[PDB]
Amino acid sequence: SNLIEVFVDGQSVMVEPGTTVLQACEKVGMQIPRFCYHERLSVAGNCRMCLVEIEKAPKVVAACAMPVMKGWNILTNSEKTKKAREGVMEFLLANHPLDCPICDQGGECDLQDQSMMFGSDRSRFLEGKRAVEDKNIGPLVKTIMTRCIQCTRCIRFASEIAGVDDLGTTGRGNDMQVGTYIEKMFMSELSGNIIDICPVGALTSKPYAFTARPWETRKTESIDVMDAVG
């Protein structure tokens, strides 16, 4: 009755047809690591972290936006899956500056967690390390676009939820500045939400900026006020 079997590590499970491989792995409990996927936005494929070795094929394919054919067998813990993840993680950490002391996401990074739990232990790339000059987006959001990994998630969030259309990719090669061209103060509603969209420390809060670091705090239940929805 409209269910397709996937063999996640040999374990069979039923999946609604048309949905992604990644939702099947999250159904059985697996987390394939991801940087450009999010469970509220459209599914672009620009981060290359979601890869998986599907059997009987010489080519590793993505799992952020893969449709599910009948009767798969998914290997999330094979050899070249780990080699692809270590390779892509070594690619990401080249043009990314040493700011982990002063970056505002010491406890709440994503490069740090996934670089521990999937990445290499030694680096390379002795020269290089380009630098992008920052902008001044607004007095609400502090912005250093050097840490921007060009993951195209603020763009999709803006253009598909904010509806404002004031963010864009510019350029080619390494030189892809994600930002706003005309030096306009990007001011709209929900612009405070963009500092949790950005998975790296590139779009942080302006008044908060250098007052804590997220392992010292303790987290507490509460309810929204001054809005009728809560």
């Binding site: 050899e79 780990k82 080699k83 270590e86 990445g119 290499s120 232990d121 030694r122 390379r124």
Partner: peptide
Amino acid sequence: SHRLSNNYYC
């Protein structure tokens, strides 16, 4: 380690 081209963490 620092032996290039073979240090595979897998």
